[PDB]
Design a protein around this ligand. Structure first.
Ligand SMILES: CCCCCCC/C=C\CCCCCC(=O)OC[C@H](CO)O[C@@H](O)[C@H](O)COC(=O)CCCCC/C=C\CCCCCCC
Ligand SMILES: CCCCCCC/C=C/CCCCCC(=O)OC[C@@H](O)CO
Ligand SMILES: CCCCCCC/C=C\CCCCCC(=O)OC[C@@H](O)CO
Ligand SMILES: CCCCCCC/C=C\CCCCCC(=O)OC[C@@H](O)CO
Ligand SMILES: CCCCCCC/C=C\CCCCCC(=O)OC[C@@H](O)CO
Ligand SMILES: CCCCCCC/C=C\CCCCCC(=O)OC[C@@H](O)CO
Ligand SMILES: CCCCCCC/C=C\CCCCCC(=O)OC[C@@H](O)CO
Ligand SMILES: CCCCCCC/C=C\CCCCCC(=O)OC[C@@H](O)CO
Ligand SMILES: CCCCCCC/C=C\CCCCCC(=O)OC[C@@H](O)CO
Ligand SMILES: CCCCCCC/C=C\CCCCCC(=O)OC[C@@H](O)CO
Ligand SMILES: CCCCCCC/C=C\CCCCCC(=O)OC[C@@H](O)CO
Ligand SMILES: CCCCCCC/C=C\CCCCCC(=O)OC[C@@H](O)CO
Ligand SMILES: CCCCCCC/C=C\CCCCCC(=O)OC[C@@H](O)CO
Ligand SMILES: CCCCCCC/C=C\CCCCCC(=O)OC[C@@H](O)CO
Ligand SMILES: CCCCCCC/C=C\CCCCCC(=O)OC[C@@H](O)CO
Ligand SMILES: CCCCCCC/C=C\CCCCCC(=O)OC[C@@H](O)CO
Ligand SMILES: CCCCCCC/C=C\CCCCCC(=O)OC[C@@H](O)CO
Ligand SMILES: CCCCCCC/C=C\CCCCCC(=O)OC[C@@H](O)CO
Ligand SMILES: CCCCCCC/C=C\CCCCCC(=O)OC[C@@H](O)CO
Length: 448
């Protein structure tokens, strides 16, 4: 019968839903840092470029953090299908905010809308893909990999199309193209979902029982009161700058996995959960390096690369390109070697080493040529080729949304250290430190 690459026809609707949301997201993130540079250069935005880079990292940290609870809200309160739809609306509104004739005054409102919108949509589109397959269906893994190919496809074309529109027609037009991309996703999702999506997921699948509503409200109200109380105290003692608020979000993002480790401590399982700790830190450190490609590598591309004949935002397409080119090779690898199946602690060790090698490579051109001129774009290509190879090995998602959030929160502190005089030392020591910790994991692989 008629399938979508051997999968139920409903996969195409969700395939295109996420390709276009990822289009809006990574198109925005390819030009947002340069947009803040522009607002700084005109005097509209009164922050340093280091603070602007810090914003990008903590921006990514909250998006991943908000995705840790979007599954709860859909499953228990609103439903998986309304969560994707109203999440997509909030994402679209966030990009429309940046297309309006405003300046720095619209940055926070657009960031808030997209943080919340992506939390509703991103975990619940992945959930709805599973609802196309029963527990029995072997096609579940193949359908998810086809779904991920649409993720990288949207992430690939977005910097090319959005970045070119920025250079040709300006920032406001480019940001409006991001909003249009999400709108395209909403059209296909709404009308397409109604034709092929189970109406069971228009409602929550585990709705709150009558006695569950009150303690959930108390839990939510206590967290909001405490967080607000901290901001109140911060203003009375004088810790009230933008970096101070960024530092607050950094601490909250890192304290969540630490507190969930500190008292989650049954010798049955107490040490087989201490198991997962040397690998959660390996994932945090890999994700930090990977997410600096949109920040530090975006800075290097605009400052240290002879790229005069094409938009510098296009470098952000190298990340999802290498994911697409590596994927069929590794699918072959994980089945061609039916009896190798290297252990997950070893893959995470070697994966972190490749990420460290990606930064070690970027220390060479500055050390060899100096930091005052410009070098070939192939240095950045080699860097992304090495860090994505580390991703192919590391291949509840909220926990994986979490290590992404903490690594990005760690970036909000480190990326302020990067500049022209910092370049070689920055790349050489965060790359070496990541490689040494990857070898330390080798010594402890199944010390577990
Ligand atoms: C069948 C797949 C095999 C692919 C693995 C090989 C990696 C692919 C390409 C490596 C190309 C080597 C670099 C070429 C070179 O040396 O540059 C020559 C060029 C002459 O015009 O000049 C320079 O001007 C440049 O300025 C000098 O600087 C460097 O070349 C430093 C290069 C950085 C080190 C890279 C060395 C080896 C990479 C091997 C990675 C293999 C990893 C596979 C898992
Ligand atoms: C998606 C971004 C990847 C871009 C990869 C580009 C690979 C180019 C390699 C050659 C180095 C730059 C050569 C400069 C050049 O030839 O410009 C032509 C001439 O006008 C000099 O400016
Ligand atoms: C307008 C200012 C607020 C912006 C909204 C940002 C909300 C972001 C994050 C709140 C979620 C924090 C709780 C996440 C959490 O603890 O889950 C982790 C747990 O699921 C691990 O699996
Ligand atoms: C209108 C307000 C903005 C939109 C509301 C959604 C804001 C995001 C989260 C609100 C908290 C809901 C409860 C989430 C929660 O308890 O997470 C627990 C965690 O274990 C999830 O697995
Ligand atoms: C700024 C835009 C305002 C909102 C415009 C869109 C609201 C118009 C009609 C409400 C549609 C709600 C549909 C919610 C939903 O679950 O859709 C899921 C989709 O699969 C269709 O069932
Ligand atoms: C329980 C709540 C957890 C913490 C969630 C709070 C996250 C809310 C907002 C994060 C936005 C990051 C900072 C945005 C920003 O600095 O842009 C505004 C700035 O350009 C104005 O000068
Ligand atoms: C389909 C509904 C949501 C999709 C977005 C619809 C609106 C998108 C674009 C409309 C025009 C964008 C405004 C462009 C703009 O004003 O900037 C250019 C100009 O101000 C600078 O010279
Ligand atoms: C200044 C630019 C306009 C700003 C407002 C843009 C809102 C325009 C249209 C809202 C699109 C709603 C989501 C698209 C969709 O497919 O919804 C279908 C559903 O509402 C039909 O019942
Ligand atoms: C930051 C502002 C957030 C405002 C909205 C957050 C609300 C969070 C928790 C309240 C959940 C109460 C929902 C009750 C509900 O819908 O179920 C009712 C029914 O199932 C009980 O019999
Ligand atoms: C539940 C216990 C509450 C105790 C307080 C919890 C939060 C403690 C400190 C939050 C500090 C916010 C970030 C630190 C900060 O403001 O640094 C200021 C500095 O960057 C210049 O203003
Ligand atoms: C999440 C629960 C509701 C919290 C209500 C209060 C939220 C206030 C701030 C959240 C963190 C965002 C901080 C970014 C910011 O406001 O920068 C302002 C900047 O001008 C500093 O002067
Ligand atoms: C008993 C609980 C375990 C032991 C407590 C461990 C500390 C818990 C949370 C602290 C989070 C780490 C601090 C965040 C951080 O490293 O950045 C600091 C920076 O943002 C301040 O400028
Ligand atoms: C298989 C890897 C190929 C070689 C990778 C090892 C590269 C080691 C160092 C990068 C080239 C160093 C350039 C020379 C240098 O940095 O010294 C500069 C300094 O002595 C001048 O004051
Ligand atoms: C070949 C694949 C892996 C790529 C990494 C191989 C290169 C390893 C390390 C290169 C870093 C060399 C650092 C040289 C250096 O810092 O010199 C200091 C001085 O020249 C600049 O301040
Ligand atoms: C798996 C792939 C590993 C990649 C290995 C790392 C190779 C990275 C950079 C090689 C730099 C060579 C650049 C020299 C070049 O061809 O252009 C000349 C330059 O002057 C033009 O601007
Ligand atoms: C097991 C949980 C994983 C935790 C990973 C994060 C490691 C904990 C704390 C990292 C603190 C980084 C502080 C960065 C720093 O101080 O330097 C940058 C600073 O100069 C920016 O002003
Ligand atoms: C010598 C340390 C043990 C070797 C472990 C192998 C690690 C992988 C590649 C070699 C990295 C060399 C980094 C060189 C370095 O850190 O120099 C820093 C430079 O800024 C000072 O000149
Ligand atoms: C065990 C978990 C590791 C996670 C955090 C790893 C890095 C922590 C702190 C780094 C901040 C110290 C800054 C060291 C430094 O000087 O680097 C900057 C230098 O490369 C350029 O000037
Ligand atoms: C300056 C030297 C640069 C190259 C050094 C990197 C290679 C040297 C040693 C790597 C292997 C060290 C021993 C690791 C090992 O096999 O531990 C046993 C472990 O596999 C069992 O879990």
């Amino acid at each position: 019968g008629k399938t979508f690459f051997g999968q139920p026809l409903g996969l195409s609707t969700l395939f295109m839903t996420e390709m276009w949301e990822r289009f809006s997201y990574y198109g925005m993130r390819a030009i947002l840092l340069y947009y803040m540079w522009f607002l700084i250069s005109t005097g509209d935005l009164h922050i340093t470029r280091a603070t602007a880079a810090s914003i990008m990292a903590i921006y990514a940290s909250m998006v991943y953090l908000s995705g840790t609870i979007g599954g709860f809200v859909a499953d228990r309160i609103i439903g998986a299908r309304p969560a994707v739809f109203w999440g997509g609306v909030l994402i679209m509104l966030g990009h429309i905010v940046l297309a309006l004739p405003f300046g720095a005054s619209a940055l926070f409102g657009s960031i808030i809308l997209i943080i919340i919108g992506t939390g509703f949509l991103k975990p619940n589109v992945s959930t709805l893909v599973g609802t196309l397959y029963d527990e029995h269906d072997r096609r579940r893994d193949a359908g998810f990999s086809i779904f991920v190919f649409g993720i990288n496809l949207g992430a690939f074309i977005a910097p090319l199309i959005v970045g070119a529109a920025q250079e040709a027609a300006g920032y406001h037009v480019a940001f409006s193209l991001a909003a249009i991309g999400m709108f395209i996703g909403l059209l296909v999702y709404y009308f397409g979902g109604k034709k092929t999506l189970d109406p069971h997921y228009l409602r929550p699948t585990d709705p709150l029982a009558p006695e569950e509503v009150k303690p959930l409200l108390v839990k939510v109200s206590l967290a909001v009161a405490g967080f607000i109380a901290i901001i109140v105290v911060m203003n009375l003692v004088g810790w009230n700058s933008l970096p101070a608020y960024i530092n607050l979000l950094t601490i909250v993002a890192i304290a969540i996995p630490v507190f969930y480790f500190a008292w989650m401590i049954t010798s049955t399982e107490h040490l087989r959960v201490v198991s997962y700790i040397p690998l959660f830190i390996a994932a945090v450190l890999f994700w930090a390096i990977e997410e600096q490609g949109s920040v530090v590598l975006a800075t290097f591309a605009a400052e240290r690369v002879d790229s005069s004949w094409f938009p510098v935002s296009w470098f952000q397409s190298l990340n999802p390109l290498f994911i697409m080119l590596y994927t069929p090779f590794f699918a072959w690898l994980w089945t061609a070697w039916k009896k190798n199946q290297p252990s997950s602690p070893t893959k995470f060790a070697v994966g972190l080493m490749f990420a460290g090698l990606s930064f070690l490579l970027m220390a060479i051109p500055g050390a060899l040529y100096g930091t005052s001129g410009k070098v070939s774009p192939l240095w950045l290509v080699g860097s992304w080729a090495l860090v994505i190879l580390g991703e192919m090995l590391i291949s509840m998602m909220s926990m994986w949304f979490l290590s992404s959030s903490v690594g990005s929160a760690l970036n909000a502190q480190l990326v302020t250290l990067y500049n022209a005089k910092s370049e070689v030392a920055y790349f050489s020591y965060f790359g070496l430190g990541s490689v040494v910790l990857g070898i330390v994991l080798v010594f402890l692989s199944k010390r577990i």
